[PDB]
């Protein structure tokens, strides 16, 4: 191993001897030295040789810097007094080409501020900026100045300093001319920034927060207005300043959240759901620029902001609802019902809000940033909220149906007590006098439910579940406990269609199997009143026993009863007698 140190420091000690002859060394020699020293860079044995070679490049670049900067300022190349032509631009491109070639020879790689050609190109702006300006509004004014200059000079300087032969591309000039024009703004801003980051006063901590937020804003506008895919003023933000901004933003969001999750004993209202929704939208409007900025050392906080605000807060909000309120024991039955309706509404509203967030471009991108860094195969970041919300929606939906059905069982008690279905005076013209109370209640109930918005299928789900519970009530508590007149049955059919009518079911569509069965059972029931030839045969108590095991092969075909069971057809026939 020592055979490559006494041999290494030999070429390394011949480099210093050729360096000791600064004059009578042309650019070709500088390339030959780069060829020899390049491998040995970063070794730290050749560090002195590096330091010398770099400070030689710098001295070889000092004169064309003073010339290029003087020519640029004395010809007013960034004003209307200068036009780009083969003559007035010729010498500028020579001085800048040589400066670029010299910068590219720095070992190991040139610093950002050592691209001397771009430093010279930006010098004019540096002088104008420092002259004109000796916080959030200041940073905004700096952007206004920067933007105006960039607008009228960027593509012009690209036309001037284009040099494909020497590596100076148009894409490079676009990136670097903006970056170097930005440097005096970074220095000016970062003075007042480090002046605030050195204080613990609230006024200070907020002024720092607003500063950082303004930086994010201006970086965003720079990327949009001049198509700049380089670093802005985000370089000024250190991890200690981010932690401050991030915590201020999460605290602001939680503070607003907690003023919405304060448990009042009054019936829950939709507003609270809409206000939490607005909170999520406002906080996303505020955090949009930060989210859109592409700096890797930023992802660590972007995920933190996504989780704590757009996942944690919705989950906590779900548990804000569904929560033991001993302060809500004084609620009416119809109040507890409306309270649940409102809960389900609010929950599904926040769900759709997150659905919209999930297709905005900034979310799609930082969702892939998360799926890459955490190696977690998430489709959307909101999958964990949705899947946790889909559970609570069922619990709520079931609660609505149960609480609704419990109430219907209560209001039909009067209608249940009526037993004169075998002695009916005439045909139905209105609804049974004992059902009027229930019909009214059931309309009050559907109207309360209809006050609020739910997805169409969840409406259908709840209302169908109640149509079925209505059928079960009519069949088991009334029909399958009485025998019916001609018009007693017509009256009952009326009553049923009135109760179905109160649900305001999404109708003109098809009918549920349970209701088809209901009307098949009615149809059989109704043969007690038509003395047809093929109906005296069927309405025999002995035909029922003798045919029950065939599943009534005859009757099924004759009467289109295709949704009732054998036992059911039997009970109907038996009920005609």
């Amino acid at each position: 191993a020592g055979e490559r140190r006494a041999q290494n420091a030999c070429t390394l000690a011949a480099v210093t001897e050729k360096l000791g002859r600064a004059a009578e060394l042309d650019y070709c020699d500088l390339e030959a030295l780069h060829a020899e020293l390049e491998p040995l860079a970063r070794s730290a044995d050749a560090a002195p040789q590096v330091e010398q070679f770099n400070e030689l490049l710098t001295e070889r670049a000092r004169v064309p810097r003073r010339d290029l900067e003087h020519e640029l300022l004395e010809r007013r190349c960034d004003t209307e007094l200068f036009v780009s032509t083969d003559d007035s631009v010729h010498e500028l491109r020579e001085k800048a080409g040589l400066l670029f070639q010299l910068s590219q020879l720095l070992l190991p790689e040139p610093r950002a501020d050592q691209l001397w050609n771009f430093v010279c190109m930006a010098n004019n702006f540096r002088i104008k900026f420092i002259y004109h300006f000796t916080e959030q509004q200041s940073i905004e004014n700096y952007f206004k100045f920067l933007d105006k200059y960039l607008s009228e000079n960027l593509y012009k300087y690209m036309d001037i300093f284009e040099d494909e032969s020497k590596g100076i591309t148009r894409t490079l000039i676009h990136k670097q001319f903006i970056n170097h024009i930005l440097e005096p703004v970074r220095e000016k801003v970062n003075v007042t920034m480090t002046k605030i980051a050195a204080s613990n006063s609230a006024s200070d901590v907020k002024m720092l927060v607003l500063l950082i937020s303004e930086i994010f804003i201006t970086d965003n506008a720079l990327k949009k207005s001049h198509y700049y895919d380089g670093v802005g003023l985000v370089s000024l933000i250190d991890e200690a300043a981010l932690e401050v901004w991030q915590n201020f933003e999460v605290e602001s969001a939680v503070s607003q959240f907690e003023k919405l999750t304060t448990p009042g004993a009054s019936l829950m209202s939709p507003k609270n759901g809409a206000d939490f929704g607005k909170l999520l939208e406002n906080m996303y409007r505020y955090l949009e620029p930060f989210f859109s900025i592409d700096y890797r050392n930023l992802f660590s906080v972007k995920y933190q902001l996504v989780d704590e605000i757009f996942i944690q807060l919705p989950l906590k909000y779900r548990s804000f609802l569904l929560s033991k309120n001993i302060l809500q024991n004084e609620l009416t039955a119809e109040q507890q019902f409306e309270n649940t309706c409102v809960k389900l509404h609010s929950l599904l509203l926040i769900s759709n809000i997150l659905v919209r967030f999930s297709h905005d471009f900034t979310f799609i991108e930082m969702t892939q940033q998360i799926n890459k860094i955490t190696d977690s195969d998430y489709e959307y970041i909101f999958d964990e909220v949705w899947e946790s919300y889909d559970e609570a929606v069922i619990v709520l939906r079931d609660s609505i149906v149960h609480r609704w059905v419990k109430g219907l069982s209560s209001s039909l008690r009067n209608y249940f007590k009526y037993n004169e279905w075998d002695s009916i005076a005439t045909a139905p013209e209105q609804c049974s006098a004992e059902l009027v109370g229930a019909l009214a209640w059931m309309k009050k109930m559907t109207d309360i439910f209809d006050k609020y918005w739910y997805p169409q299928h969840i409406i259908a789900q709840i209302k169908v579940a109640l149509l079925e519970n209505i059928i079960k009530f009519m069949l088991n508590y009334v029909v399958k406990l009485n025998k019916f007149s001609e018009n007693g049955l017509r009256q009952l059919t009326f009553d049923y269609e009135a109760l179905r009518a109160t649900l305001g079911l999404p109708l003109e569509h098809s009918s549920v199997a349970e209701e088809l069965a209901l009307f098949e059972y009615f149809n059989i029931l109704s043969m007690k009143y038509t003395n047809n030839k093929i109906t005296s045969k069927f309405l025999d108590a002995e035909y029922v026993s003798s045919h029950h095991t065939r599943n009534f092969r005859e009757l099924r075909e004759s009467l289109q009863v295709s949704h009732l069971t054998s036992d059911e057809i039997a009970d109907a026939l038996y009920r005609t007698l």
Binding site: H359, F361, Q456, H457, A460, H509, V512, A513
Partner: protein, 94 residues
């Protein structure tokens, strides 16, 4: 129109056309999101309708169309998000 299965039938075509606008003005992304939300809702309605057609089969084509539509919506969100990315990439390199 009125039937769920023809509402879904048309809405699928519409949702596919939004992805390739002959407009100039790009994607009407808010309208697309609104449509996919309505597609999900209508899907749920068709699902309920099929389910509640037999009490607690010849309802096979409806189940097939339902499955292929649920798969459609699932893939369509990926197609949409891709298009949304592409549309901003294109309007940055111009």
């Amino acid at each position: 129109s009125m039937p769920y299965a023809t509402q879904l039938a048309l809405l699928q075509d519409e949702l596919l056309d939004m992805l390739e606008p002959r407009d100039g003005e790009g994607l009407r992304t808010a309208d697309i999101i609104d449509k996919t939300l309505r597609f999900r809702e209508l899907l749920g309605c068709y699902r309920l309708q099929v389910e509640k057609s037999t009490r607690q089969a010849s309802q096979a084509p409806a189940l097939a169309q339902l499955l292929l539509w649920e798969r459609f919506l699932a893939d369509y969100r990926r197609r949409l998000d891709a298009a949304i990315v592409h549309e901003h990439e294109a309007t940055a390199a111009r």
